[PDB]
Amino acid sequence: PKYIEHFSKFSPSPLSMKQFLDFGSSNACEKTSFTFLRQELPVRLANIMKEINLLPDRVLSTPSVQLVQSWYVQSLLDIMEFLDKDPEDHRTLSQFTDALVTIRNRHNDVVPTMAQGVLEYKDTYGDDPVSNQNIQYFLDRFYLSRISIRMLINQHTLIFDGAHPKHIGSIDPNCNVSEVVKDAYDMAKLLCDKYYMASPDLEIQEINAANSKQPIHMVYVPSHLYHMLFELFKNAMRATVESHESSLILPPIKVMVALGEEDLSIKMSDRGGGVPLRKIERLFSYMYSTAPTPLAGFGYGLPISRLYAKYFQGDLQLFSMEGFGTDAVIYLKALSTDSVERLPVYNKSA
Amino acid sequence: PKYIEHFSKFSPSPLSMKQFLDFGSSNACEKTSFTFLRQELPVRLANIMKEINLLPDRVLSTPSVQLVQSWYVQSLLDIMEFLDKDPEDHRTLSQFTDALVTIRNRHNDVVPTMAQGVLEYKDTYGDDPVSNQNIQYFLDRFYLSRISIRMLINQHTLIFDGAHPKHIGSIDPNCNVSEVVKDAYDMAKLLCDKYYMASPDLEIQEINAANSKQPIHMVYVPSHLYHMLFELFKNAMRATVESHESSLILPPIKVMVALGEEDLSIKMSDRGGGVPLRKIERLFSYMYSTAPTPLAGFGYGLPISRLYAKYFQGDLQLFSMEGFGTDAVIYLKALSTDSVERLPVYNKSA
Numbered sequence: 001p002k003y004i005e006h007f008s009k010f011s012p013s014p015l016s017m018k019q020f021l022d023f024g025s026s027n028a029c030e031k032t033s034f035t036f037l038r039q040e041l042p043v044r045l046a047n048i049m050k051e052i053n054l055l056p057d058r059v060l061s062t063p064s065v066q067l068v069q070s071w072y073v074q075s076l077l078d079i080m081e082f083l084d085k086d087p088e089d090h091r092t093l094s095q096f097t098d099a100l101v102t103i104r105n106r107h108n109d110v111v112p113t114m115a116q117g118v119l120e121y122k123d124t125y126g127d128d129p130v131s132n133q134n135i136q137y138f139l140d141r142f143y144l145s146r147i148s149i150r151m152l153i154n155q156h157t158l159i160f161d162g163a164h165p166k167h168i169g170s171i172d173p174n175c176n177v178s179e180v181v182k183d184a185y186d187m188a189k190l191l192c193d194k195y196y197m198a199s200p201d202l203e204i205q206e207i208n209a210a211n212s213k214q215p216i217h218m219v220y221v222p223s224h225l226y227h228m229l230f231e232l233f234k235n236a237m238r239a240t241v242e243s244h245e246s247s248l249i250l251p252p253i254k255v256m257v258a259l260g261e262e263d264l265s266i267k268m269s270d271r272g273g274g275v276p277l278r279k280i281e282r283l284f285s286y287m288y289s290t291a292p293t294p295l296a297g298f299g300y301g302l303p304i305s306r307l308y309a310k311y312f313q314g315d316l317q318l319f320s321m322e323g324f325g326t327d328a329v330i331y332l333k334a335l336s337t338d339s340v341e342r343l344p345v346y347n348k349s350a
Numbered sequence: 351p352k353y354i355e356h357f358s359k360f361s362p363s364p365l366s367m368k369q370f371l372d373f374g375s376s377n378a379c380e381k382t383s384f385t386f387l388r389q390e391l392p393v394r395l396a397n398i399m400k401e402i403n404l405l406p407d408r409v410l411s412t413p414s415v416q417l418v419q420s421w422y423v424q425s426l427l428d429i430m431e432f433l434d435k436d437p438e439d440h441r442t443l444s445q446f447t448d449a450l451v452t453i454r455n456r457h458n459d460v461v462p463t464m465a466q467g468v469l470e471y472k473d474t475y476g477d478d479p480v481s482n483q484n485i486q487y488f489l490d491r492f493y494l495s496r497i498s499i500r501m502l503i504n505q506h507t508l509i510f511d512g513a514h515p516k517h518i519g520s521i522d523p524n525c526n527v528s529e530v531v532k533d534a535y536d537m538a539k540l541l542c543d544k545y546y547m548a549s550p551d552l553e554i555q556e557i558n559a560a561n562s563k564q565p566i567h568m569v570y571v572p573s574h575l576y577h578m579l580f581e582l583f584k585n586a587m588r589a590t591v592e593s594h595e596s597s598l599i600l601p602p603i604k605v606m607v608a609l610g611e612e613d614l615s616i617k618m619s620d621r622g623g624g625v626p627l628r629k630i631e632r633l634f635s636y637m638y639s640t641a642p643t644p645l646a647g648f649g650y651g652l653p654i655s656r657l658y659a660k661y662f663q664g665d666l667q668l669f670s671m672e673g674f675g676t677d678a679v680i681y682l683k684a685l686s687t688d689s690v691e692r693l694p695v696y697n698k699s700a
C-alpha cells in the first residue's frame with residue numbers, strides 16, 4: 001500500500017510538554033496545528049498500520065484485526081484529503097476539526113476488539129510463552145501509538161473550537177497531584193462499596209523535598225494520571241477486602257506523593273495479602289488478562305496504565321510481599337522539559 | 351583443551367536444599383560425596399572455563415583473566431587426579447578433603463582480580479553500554495558459578511572432618527531470619543559509627559501469614575543471607591547519614607520479614623533521600639561500580655548480593671522514591687523443596 005508506504009517512511013516526531021503548551025497558548029496557532037497534524041497524523045497512522053501488516057497471516061486475517069485495520073485505513077484516507085487544502089480558509093480548519101472527531105469516535109471500540117482477537121488466538125493457537133511475548137510486544141506498541149494519536153487529536157479539538165484558559169486541552173500546567181489521587185480514590189471507593197458493602201480508607205502523605213511546605217503540583221495530563229490511580233485503587237481495594245473476610249477492620253490504602261529533582265513518584269500501598277514474586281509479571285500480560293466481572297483483575301487496565309506512565313517517559317512498577325501486601329509506584333518526570341512523548345518507531349530492528 | 355572439552359560436555363547438576371541436607375545427615379555419606387564431587391566439580395569448572403575462553407582475545411589475553419584462568423586450570427588438574435582412586439581408602443578421602451581446601455584458597459582473590467580486569471578494559475577500550483552489558487552478562491554467570499562451586503566445597507569440607515549437628519555445613523535447617531537481620535545490622539552499625547559518629551536505629555517487624563505468633567524460620571545458608579543484609583545495611587546507613595547532615599535525628603532503618611506460602615520476603619527501608627529511577631540499574635553494574643573508600647557504593651557488594659539471592663531461586667530488588675528514601679526486598683523460597691541451585695549452563699545459545 002503506497003499511501004501507507006509513503007508516510008511510513010517518516011518517523012513520528014515526539015513532542016515535549018512545553019511544545020504542547022505552546023500549540024494551545026493561542027487561538028492564532030490553529031493554522032500551525034493543522035499544517036502540523038495533517039502531516040504528523042498520517043505518519044503515526046501509517047507507522048502502526050505497517051506494523052499491523054507485519055503480523056503473521058494467521059493473526060492478520062482474523063476478523064478483529066481486519067476490522068481494526070479497516071478503521072486505520074479509513075482514518076488515513078480522511079486526513080490525506082486535507083493535504084492539498086489551504087490553511088487560510090476557515091472552512092478548511094473547521095472541517096479539519098470535524099474530521100478529527102469522526103476519526104476519534106470510529107476507533108472508540110479498539111480495546112475490546114483487540115481483546116476479542118487475543119481470545120481467539122488463545123483458543124485457536126494456544127497460550128504458550130512465545131505467543132505471550134509477541135502479543136505483549138505488539139499490543140504495548142499498538143496501544144502506546146493509539147494513546148499518542150489520541151493525545152494529538154484531543155489537543156487540537158479541545159483547544160480550537162471557538163478565551164485564555166488555565167487548562168490547555170488535556171494538559172493541566174498546575175496539576176494538584178493529591179487532588180487527583182483523592183478523586184480516583186473516591187470513585188473506586190464508590191464501586192467497592194457497591195460490590196462489597198465496605199471499603200478501605202485513604203491516607204495521603206506528601207514529601208516535597210526541595211520545599212517541604214508546598215503542595216505538590218506538576219505539568220501533566222490529569223485524565224491519564226486519574227486512569228492509572230483509579231485502576232490501581234480498584235486492585236488495592238479488591239485485594240484488601242477479599243483478604244480480610246474474617247477481620248472487622250479493613251487496613252487503609254496509603255499513598256505517598258514524593259517530589260524530587262527528576263522524579264515525581266506516587267506510591268500506593270495495600271495490606272491485601274500480596275502475591276508471590278513469580279506471579280507479578282503475568283498481571284501485566286494481555287494474554288493472561290483475557291478471558292471469556294470482579295472489581296479488578298480482568299481486562300487491560302493494569303498494562304494500559306503502565307503505558308500511560310511510559311508515554312511521557314515515566315514508569316509503573318509493582319512490588320509485593322506475599323503474606324502482607326503490595327506497593328505500586330507511578331514514576332513521572334518532575335520537569336516539563338523532560339516530559340517528552342514516547343512513541344513506538346517502525347525501524348528495521350522492529 | 352580436551353580435559354576441559356570432555357567435562358564441558360556435561361551439564362552441571364543443580365541440587366536442592368533437601369539433597370544437600372541428605373549428604374551431610376551422616377558421616378557414612380563421605381564416600382557418596384567424594385564420588386559425586388570428583389565428577390561434578392570438574393563439570394562445573396570446565397563449564398565456566400569454556401565460557402572464559404569464549405571471551406574476545408582483547409579480554410582473554412589480559413593478565414587478570416589469564417591469571418584467573420590459570421587457577422581454574424590448576425584446580426581442574428588437582429581434582430581429575432582422584433578420578434581413578436578408590437573410594438574405600440580413607441587416605442583417598444582425607445587427601446580429597448585436603449585438595450578441596452587448597453582449591454578454595456587458590457581462588458580467594460578472584461573478585462578484586464576480575465575487577466582489575468574490568469578497570470583495564472574501561473581504560474583500554476571504554477565504557478560504552480554494549481561493553482557494560484557483556485561485562486554484566488559474563489560476571490553474573492562467572493560469579494554465580496563460583497558461588498555454586500564454593501557451596502559444594504564448603505558442604506564437603508565442613509561436614510567431613512572427623513557428631514549429630516544442628517547446622518549441616520553452611521546450611522541451617524532452622525535459620526532464625528530476624529536474628530541474622532540483627533547480626534548484620536549490628537555489624538554495619540559498628541562500621542557506620544566509626545565512619546560517621548552516628549548511625550540509624552533498627553526496627554524489625556515480622557508477618558508470619560499462616561501462623562501469626564510464630565517467629566519466622568527457614569532452611570537456608572545463613573552466611574549468604576548475612577552477606578546480603580550486611581551490604582544492604584551499609585548502603586542504607588550511608589544514605590541515611592549523608593542525607594541528614596542538617597538534622598539532629600536520624601530516621602531508623604525498618605525491616606519487615608514476611609512469610610508466605612511460596613515467598614519469604616525481607617524488605618529493608620531507609621529514608622536516605624532516594625535516587626531517580628534512571629540511576630537504579632547502574633547500582634548493579636560491575637563496570638560502573640569499578641573505579642581506581644566510603645562505607646558503601648563501590649565494589650561489587652550489591653550485584654554479588656543479588657547473585658546470592660538468585661542462587662537458590664530468589665531475587666533482590668531495589669525500589670526508590672527520589673526525595674524520600676529506598677526499599678530493598680530480598681525474595682527467598684519459603685519451601686526447602688523449591689530451593690534449588692541456579693547454575694549458569696554452557697548451552698549453544700550462550
Ligand SMILES: CCNc1cc(F)cc2c1NC(=O)[C@@]2(CC)N1CCC[C@@H](NC(=O)C2CC3(C2)CN(C#N)C3)C1
Nearest residue numbers: 235236238239268269270272274275288296297326328
Ligand atoms: C497498592 C496497589 N495494589 C495492587 C495493584 C495492582 F495493580 C495489583 C494488585 C495490587 N494488590 C494485589 O494484591 C494485586 C496483585 C499484586 N491484586 C489486586 C486484586 C486483583 C488481583 N488480580 C488477579 O488476581 C487477576 C489475575 C487474574 C485475575 C487474571 N486471571 C487469569 N488467568 C487470574 C491482583
Ligand SMILES: CCNc1cc(F)cc2c1NC(=O)[C@@]2(CC)N1CCC[C@@H](NC(=O)C2CC3(C2)CN(C#N)C3)C1
Nearest residue numbers: 585586588589618619620622624625638646647676678
Ligand atoms: C534500604 C536499602 N537502601 C539502599 C540499598 C542499596 F543497595 C542502595 C541504596 C540504598 N539507599 C540509597 O539511597 C542507595 C541508592 C538507591 N545508595 C546508598 C548510599 C551509597 C549509594 N551508592 C552510590 O552512590 C554509588 C554509585 C557510585 C557510588 C559508583 N560510582 C560511579 N561511577 C558512583 C547508593
Ligand SMILES: CC(C)c1ccc(COc2ccc(CC(=O)NCCN)cc2Cl)cc1
Nearest residue numbers: 055056059114117118121130131134135138
Ligand atoms: C489479536 C492481536 C492482539 C494479536 C493476537 C495474536 C498475536 C500472536 O502473534 C504472534 C504469535 C507467534 C509468533 C511466532 C511466529 O510465527 N514468528 C514468525 C516465524 N516466521 C509471532 C506472532 Cl506476531 C499477536 C497479536
Ligand SMILES: CC(C)c1ccc(COc2ccc(CC(=O)NCCN)cc2Cl)cc1
Nearest residue numbers: 405406409464467468471480481484485488
Ligand atoms: C575482565 C572481565 C571481567 C571482562 C572485561 C571486559 C569484558 C568485555 O567483553 C566484551 C566487550 C564487548 C564485546 C562485543 C564484541 O566484540 N562481540 C563479538 C563481536 N564479534 C564482547 C565482550 Cl565479551 C568482559 C569481561
